[PDB]
């Protein structure tokens, strides 16, 4: 059994001046939207709900920004749709009295 | 772009979309391009003259 022949494979992870070209299998969950959930789409850890837009955005782009320049307009990768950014609701308590 | 000259390119605006992307990361100052040439019956076949 010892004198079998064997067939080794060796496998070398080395890191570089160069960005990551090879990645393990990137886990994705469940996308939910019209809920104020957080999300971090590898570039911004954004907090709000995720609508539906009628904007289309050219085959090249991940990210988008508006007038205000903030990021409001993030592409979706596995499905390659598009879904905007809003923040969920904030304001005070106003009060009447008699 | 399709257009219909030879010299003095038009005046017409026309973005330039992007193409693949290359994550390589070396080391780069100088190019040169790459031409074709043609060797029909005319020509006797040798690169020289
Ligand atoms: C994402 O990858 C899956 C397979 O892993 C594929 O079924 C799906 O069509 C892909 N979505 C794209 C390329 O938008
Ligand atoms: C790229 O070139 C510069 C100067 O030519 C050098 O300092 C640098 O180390 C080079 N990068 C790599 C990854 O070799």
């Given at each position: 059994v010892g004198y079998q022949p064997y067939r080794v494979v060796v496998l070398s992870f080395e890191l570089l001046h160069?960005?990551?070209t090879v990645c393990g299998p990137k886990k994705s969950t469940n996308l939910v939207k019209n809920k104020c959930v957080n999300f971090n789409f590898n570039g911004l850890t954004g907090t709000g709900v995720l609508t539906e837009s009628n904007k289309k955005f050219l085959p090249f782009q991940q990210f988008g920004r508006d007038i205000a320049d903030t990021t409001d307009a993030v592409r979706d990768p596995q499905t390659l749709e598009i879904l905007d950014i809003t923040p969920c609701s904030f304001g005070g308590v106003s009060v009447i009295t008699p | 772009t399709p257009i219909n000259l030879v010299?003095?390119?038009?005046q017409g605006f026309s973005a330039l979309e992007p193409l693949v992307d290359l994550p390589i990361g070396i080391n780069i100052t100088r190019f040169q391009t790459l031409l074709a040439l043609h060797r029909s019956y005319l020509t006797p076949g040798d690169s020289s003259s």
């Open positions: 160069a960005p990551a | 010299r003095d390119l038009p």
